[PDB]
Design a binder for this molecule. Structure first.
Ligand SMILES: *[C@H]1O[C@@H](CO)[C@@H](O)[C@H](O)[C@H]1O
Length: 33
């Protein structure tokens, strides 16, 4: 689904984002869109 090292995440308010476990980077929008 996601590009290398990326996975789906979510804030405690119910808002969804993307996070990279290899580099600790994050985006609100889909990585390599
Ligand atoms: C959840 O709410 C968002 C919109 O206010 C943003 O502030 C953040 O992703 C979280 O705090």
């Amino acid at each position: 689904k996601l590009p290398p090292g990326w996975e789906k995440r979510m804030f405690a308010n119910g808002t969804v984002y993307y996070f990279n476990h290899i580099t600790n980077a994050s985006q609100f929008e889909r990585p390599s869109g």
